[PDB]
From a paper:
Langya virus (LayV) was recently found in shrews and isolated from febrile patients in China, representing the first human-infecting HNV from shrew origin. LayV F and G are closely related to MojV F and G but distantly related to their NiV and HeV counterparts.
Residues 166 to 175 of the intervening linker region mediates interprotomer interactions with a neighboring head domain. The four LayV G head domains form a fourfold symmetrical clamp around the central stalk with each β-propeller interacting with two neighboring heads and with the stalk helices from two distinct protomers. The LayV G head domain conformation observed in our structure differs from that found in NiV G, as the latter glycoprotein adopts an asymmetric organization of its head domains with only two of them interacting with the stalk. The observed LayV G head conformation and symmetry are unique among characterized paramyxovirus attachment glycoproteins. Approximately twenty additional residues could be resolved at the N-terminal region of the stalk, relative to the NiV G structure, revealing a 310-helix at residues 86 to 89.
Author numbering:
A (entry chain C), B (entry chain D): 166 to 214
C (entry chain D): 574 to 607
D (entry chain A): 215 to 385, 390 to 607
E (entry chain B), F (entry chain A): 68 to 111
The structure:
Amino acid sequence: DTTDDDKVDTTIKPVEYYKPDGCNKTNDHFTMQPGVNFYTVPNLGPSSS
Amino acid sequence: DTTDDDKVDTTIKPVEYYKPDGCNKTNDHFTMQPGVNFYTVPNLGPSSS
Amino acid sequence: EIWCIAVTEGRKQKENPQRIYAHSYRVQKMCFNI
Amino acid sequence: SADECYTNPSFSIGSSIYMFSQEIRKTDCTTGEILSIQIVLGRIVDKGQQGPQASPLLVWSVPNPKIINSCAVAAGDETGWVLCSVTLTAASGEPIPHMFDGFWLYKFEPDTEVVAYRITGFAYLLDKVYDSVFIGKGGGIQRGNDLYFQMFGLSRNRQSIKALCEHGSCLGGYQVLCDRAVMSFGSEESLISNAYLKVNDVASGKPTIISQTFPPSDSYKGSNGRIYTIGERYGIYLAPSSWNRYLRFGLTPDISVRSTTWLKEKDPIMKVLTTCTNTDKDMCPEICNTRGYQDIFPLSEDSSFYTYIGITPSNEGTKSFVAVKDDAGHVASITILPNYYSITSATISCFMYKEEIWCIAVTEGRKQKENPQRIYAHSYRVQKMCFNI
Amino acid sequence: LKAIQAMLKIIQDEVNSKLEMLVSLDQLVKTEIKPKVSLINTAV
Amino acid sequence: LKAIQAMLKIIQDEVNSKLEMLVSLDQLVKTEIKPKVSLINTAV
Ligand SMILES: *[C@@H]1O[C@H](CO)[C@@H](O)[C@H](O)[C@H]1NC(C)=O
Ligand SMILES: *[C@@H]1O[C@H](CO)[C@@H](O)[C@H](O)[C@H]1NC(C)=O
Ligand SMILES: [Zn+2]
């Protein structure tokens, strides 16, 4: 509860890995896939022409 | 779905023309008309006195 | 929906200098049964 | 700064923009040096507060403030105006107090430079000959391509004086006092009078000025006033300056003297900044000085309803209230500013906001006894009511 | 020697004139910019 | 005496050149910064 008390901005955190929560049954395959969209992130830093 | 992924700002798009979607019946006339209001768009560019 | 912007030259008052103005409107799709 | 005094405020609201002007004098507040004159243009906006809030866009100072008798503002549609009366200067470049040398007119617009015009001897044609001219503090209006302001000053006279002398039951000596009150230094040939001032054809870039004076027979000693717009009609407010301290407000279909008629109401009665001794009941003629200003804002087409702020002197500065007077003569009032030592003046402008009538009052006064004079602004609303007797 | 006196006349005129820009710039920053930066700060 | 004439040549060149920065700076503040500060103020 108190873990974020001293953070100035709480938008993001360090990675907390996914777990097979319930995906442990017979013939049950746990996996990960990328999303379909690939968004732009403008103005990460300065550029020129 | 991915068509807007690389846009910085998605407020407007290029024109996609209207179609007579269902307005193809006997004695059914498809048309277009202007709206009643004519709004101001201030500060399109600099001016002076 | 389709919106349009019109840019025009003119004068607000008779004695004013010429200036450029801009206004916007929309096109409304309509379908009439005769 | 404790050596600076803010006075002679002028405030007017247009469609979305407001004009505000203030003078800064040194120490005296009345006869002290003018250090600067400042004009502010801005908008009235909703900032998530209980009432309407100000938002300055352009702040500008008047050049060569030392040669100005007075300035007043007017506001229209996305534009504002400032009209200043100026005095003569000596060969040394120093101004000569209480003299007249034409007018300056300024035009203000958003995100734009200020345009100045000079109105000189061949541009202004005054009804009579004036030695000194002042522009009414209250401000003026714009109608079409013309501006209307109120003015007063010293007018040369050659006719016999028969001054207006209306009062309540009072114990021809009074007529003599009434005739003397309007004279400057007791000289019959020098009167202090009010007049309308019209600025013609402002859009042409070459404005001219025409005035029209009120005769003594229907006027008291000249004073600060304001021009109002009331639907298709107009109105004029003239502050107390002498023995008559009753409300003086008139209506007219056109900006002219002959067509002007006056209201029969008395409230507010001015009680502050006066040397008069007459009682509020009889208002007997005497020779005295009043230098306050408390205007009103009409809430109906015939000014049968109006809102005003009353001020009364006490042993601890002043006490104040906001009031609305209805067409039956009844007055509803609420006490205001309990934490302020003193308030000496008030000007009121009203507008529609959130589908109801709201008003802003600008006042001069002091928060604490030892403070310098400053200008404050507050807002309130008028609530429509209907009672079954 | 007059060449030197002439040279100083040239130098003085050029410098005294150009430094007018410094006076104007300073007045602008203090009167125009400083005030609105304060207004903007409060707003945000 | 030529030492003095040379000295003035040095002084003039150094000052006249450096003051170009003042002209550029002033143009920048009036053209670039002032306008957007106004735009920002209105927005907020
Ligand atoms: C899977 O995990 C659940 C607990 O969430 C457990 O009850 C169940 O017996 C497990 N099944 C297998 C095959 O591990
Ligand atoms: C109109 O279009 C519809 C499909 O939306 C179609 O079913 C119908 O038969 C068409 N009628 C005519 C006259 O084309
Ligand atoms: Zn009543």
